[PDB]
């Protein structure tokens, strides 16, 4: 097309017009409602102003890719976006801020030919985006006259700028700055202010040679463009040097004997030692070290926070806590104690590496003066070789899990003779090599002053996070703004020896170490009532001041003051010695008796104390209940224990963890004696925690350098006992694929693995499940894989006697056999843990197990045939893709599953729509979706973390670093207004659970209990239509369409449609005096004012016909005669008039019927009767398929027929002087019209059979609690007006609630009260707008009408909704199995 036809101009109702990809040389050769229009990629050369001025309500403009020369002047319109890129426009108007200042958002003008821009162009406060690429802008307007505070992306690439200042309020708004292909040579200082800027582009600038250091003050910047840049300050992650625009922690350790303190003053000063150290758990000074001879390329002065964690053979396994990364560990050992000192030193070397990796470690030999000089050179060479033999493998490589120690790492001190003192000083300085601070050093004096202030007063010398950040901020020159900088401020402060993180912060270890010493010295006491239990109030006098909440918190992290029930505390260091009571006597019935033995190489001193105490607290947790451990739920009895081993009797099962000598090929060392016989659940909590205590206390997994991982697990052969020990390294590996093994001494007799190691087969579980491989068929292909869950846990598609299931097999295929041995062991250690927690779940909406297999090791879950929730929502992604009814069912099932597992002390993690499995989308069926729990917790996961993700998973239901980072501070995603979603009540849960306040969010049972109220899903939204006069509706689909307001020329009608919730007409002028009644059918409107006249419109009255009185209501009836919808209606005087309905008729034949005259003669009712008072006629109805009609007459109900047009019956269901309000005919169940009626003052209700004309029932509507009440059938409580919703019958009240009742016995089934609407006013008029929705108008004292809309649920919807709620509750509570 070369031009748009002129006829499009006259289309004033047109809104969208697309004419792109054409040859429109001229746009033309009214339209005030146009919103979207594109004329881009055309041959347009100039835009006439007359054509564009007609768009008074335009929203989008597109004149890009055109040959335009002069831009048209702006006009009055709420334009939102304009595009004029790739044009030849050499000028722009300077009036866009007159009308588009608060409306225009997006401006595209790239690839244009402006040498300058107007100043007013930057005055748009509502600007969203701006592009100016490929422009000749050699100058810019001044920054002080710019008000564009909402701009987010600024584009200035391919410009002549700089051949330059911008305002600072774009710092928190702008994110992308484009300055590529420019002639800029120096960076203006204003660039260093944009905090929220994310991407920087300043490439293709030959004039760039240096970058100001202040550019690094922006933390959101991540992208730096250095392409085609002749930069110099950039070294050959780029913000590291821009962002940053001597103190080391050294630890000396060793055996409790030897000096370990004489080395200090030998390094501190010269000469022989002259100070007696005595005994001290720790001492700390800031030792100085200068440059020795030969030093080069190093700092002149380096300050060491010297440090000696010594102990009197005690304080082991706790002094390890004083180990930090990036430290200089130097162990001190005696050269005169022979090779056995090196074997002792094995513990320290492995402990240091396993706790503080990537930290340099040195070895030094003191007290060597006893070594004679004749063989001295030979002696260290032999002694150093063994020390190197530990760190270096026999092949020459570094031993696994050992510090990096080379040949040039061993030296000598000779404290008394002073020889070699200078040797250490040069190397310690030398080894320091091969390794923001201005503010971090500024924090140093604060914490050191914090140490000094608490030193005089002996205050508790530990700083919690609350007292830290205030201390950080209060310091002078406090520039700590970045959150990661504050964390790095503490992280760096650990390595200067001033703070200890303890993953609560501890500053001075001297107070910390001494405080633990006093607790370690309670052996001399009142015998603590034996068996190591101390009362809480009995420990107060044993440095503390009312800080027991936190002072006794880190004592639990030290495994020394674990809490116990009945308000008691335990001390591992003071366990009972050996209460015998004939232990191991007749504790061996030899019935499914399993025994397991460990080696652990060398037994430490802090092992038994930290182990037995750890057993008791975990053991006492199981019976107190009446991924974390979820096994061994058996009963606890007599709980006898001592300093080494315990003995607990569960189900008559002697679980003994006693300790005794163990004899492998090396017939030495101590080990475990784990036995667990019962009748046959074989559960090992001992092995699980014992394999976990090594994480808190490493250095027991000693590889011994030369391929000897002497952390061994052994079991005795029951046949051989009738002793050889069966290794774990081959037992478990033979337990992963086969059931029978070959005993070395009994090759022909295969011992059953179910007896030699029952736990690895988890015979604990009941025999019911026991999935077999014979019947099941499955495949290992990728096509059957349903994803992964981390650490193996592969899923496949399997058939279980014909029922498809999703097996979860643990496929993990990562000396090397020990590596596989510990890899296979952790699988069963976690396979049982997840199986125990899943098998315990029997909730209907939780995926339950169907079986467990060992050969192959796997177990099958329940597979949803209809994929995941994310998958099904993909194709359907208007609003509410799942469905109005399906949404509530699904939103309750998730809550129900959340309610059960939160009750079961199980906490989800990453509640994602992918994790949701959907079974059936059918509404009639009961259960649709179910969960799959990942992980538990003990009574980032913080219980209510799922509720924060509950909104996110349900956010997409209504519809990764920087991908999900705004949730930290709290930013709500894009959600529509409640007025259009039509499901407002649940959108309260979107405002809910979406705030940083965790305790504000409700509990899972509270959300489930909220599903009980049927108001939750029936409610659509709340709408306000301003100040109106009366509520009117109309028949059909058009909904309520009038909402009159005003008087005479101010008489206006506000059209409010319910389906969308918008106002297509808002107070449009229309002549006419005050109106009382209206009706709309087909295309005919019958609007009647209170001037006793009727006006009609073909939607300025078409014609006017007078009436004897003021009419009250209209209702057309289907007489099925000449397709006439006879519009007979009653007036205030009580008479009724019948009018023709064809527009091609005069419409003047009133044919009025005298209601009083008919009653006088036909029914012999005297004028003196109260029923003869001229009551206004309230409402009609249609009955007998329109063949007969009733209408209101005070207390009676006169009946009128379409055939004879005469009253045939007189019926009185009320007593004088009552007036009836409204009357409705449903006839939905089966024939048998069930017409109803109400009252103005008696608030009653009637039950009438049309054929019988009998008062079947009289239900009273005045009951304040109509929740599931009943009635027999043959100020805020008054009923307002009746209306039929499909089959059910609603009785809205003046209090705002609607009383829906069911049809024989009549039962009221719900009370859809809306307690969130009381302030909005009082309900006056309510009516049905469509067969699926009902509206009610809340009118307040201020004459303002508020629209409340409820879903039109019939008998079917409520019955299936009510049964769905109760059945799932039945399906869980009634399941006692
Ligand atoms: N004669 C001599 N004694 C030494 C040497 N090195 C250490 N010592 C002794 O070690 C003792 C100090 O040990 P101590 O500090 O109590 O050990 P710690 O508790 O582990 O720190 C001093 O009494 C010294 O006599 C040495 O080279 N020569």
Residue numbers in the entry: 341 to 369, 378 to 511, 540 to 612, 621 to 629, 637 to 826, 843 to 910, 919 to 957, 963 to 1046, ...
Article excerpt on this structure:
Leucine-rich repeat kinase (LRRK) 1 is a multidomain protein which, near-uniquely, contains both a Ras-like GTPase domain and kinase domain in the same polypeptide chain. LRRK1 consists of N-terminal ankyrin repeats, leucine-rich repeats, and C-terminal Roc (Ras-of-complex) GTPase domain, COR (C-terminal of Roc) scaffolding domain, kinase domain and a WD40 repeat domain at the C-terminus. Despite this, the exact physiological roles of both LRRK1 and LRRK2 remain unclear. Instead, it phosphorylates Rab7, a key player in lysosomal biogenesis and trafficking.
Here, we report the cryo-EM structure of the monomeric full-length LRRK1, and a lower-resolution map of the LRRK1 dimer. Local refinement improved the resolution of the C-terminal Roc-COR/kinase/WD40 catalytic domains to 3.8 Å in the LRRK1 monomer map. The overall structure of the LRRK1 monomer is ‘O-shaped’. The structure is relatively compact, with the Roc, COR, kinase and WD40 domains arranged in a ‘J-shape’. The ankyrin repeats are not well defined in the density, implying that they are flexible in the monomer, although poorly defined density N-terminal of the LRRs in the monomer map may correspond to the ankyrin repeats. However, we included GDP in the atomic model as we did observe density for GDP in the Roc active site, likely representing endogenous GDP. In the structure, the LRRK1 kinase domain is in an inactive conformation, and packs closely to the COR-B domain. The kinase regulatory (R)-spine is broken, the αC helix is in the ‘out’ position, and the conserved K1270/E1307 ion pair is broken (between the αC helix and N-lobe, equivalent to the K72/E91 ion pair in PKA), all markers of an inactive kinase.
